[PDB]
Amino acid sequence: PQITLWKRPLVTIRIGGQLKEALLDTGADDTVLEEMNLPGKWKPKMIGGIGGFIKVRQYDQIPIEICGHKAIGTVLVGPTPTNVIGRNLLTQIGCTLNF
């Protein structure tokens, strides 16, 4: 589908048996999700952005469905005010920017 940018590009995602709203973010290298108790091993990581860095937990090979499109990859979990779908997953669902 085609998504206009008049409003934040929020879509429904499915991860770890849960439905959430997430922001399609072409400006994010990674996918960062709100704090959630996912099972499995994780490794500590530090990621940054505008106001500085935050500590997050890195989970690998997590199945995730974005707007009905299946994907699988690395997700970072931490204290973020919003769920962000970064380029690592956007490329998997064939997402492109057009103008």
Place this chain on the structure above:
Amino acid sequence: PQITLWKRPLVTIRIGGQLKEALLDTGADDTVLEEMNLPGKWKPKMIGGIGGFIKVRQYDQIPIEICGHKAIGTVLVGPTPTNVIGRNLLTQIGCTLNF
């Protein structure tokens, strides 16, 4: 043009009569550029990102050429890791997400 996301979506912009590189970011509501001198008066403002809030200078009605396309809107200048072109300007050039 159609831009894939395997690499960061960086484009060249011309502003204040000078060239710079910026990121086309669908996740950003506003446009934030690295510290630089811009004609006109500015107003102190604060914006939040991942990591926290920062103090920026707000310049209104600034003309900016993005990859050959003209736009005129609000631009925020402050201590940012990279130049980000947000939705306020992306909408002006007719940018959309597609998959």
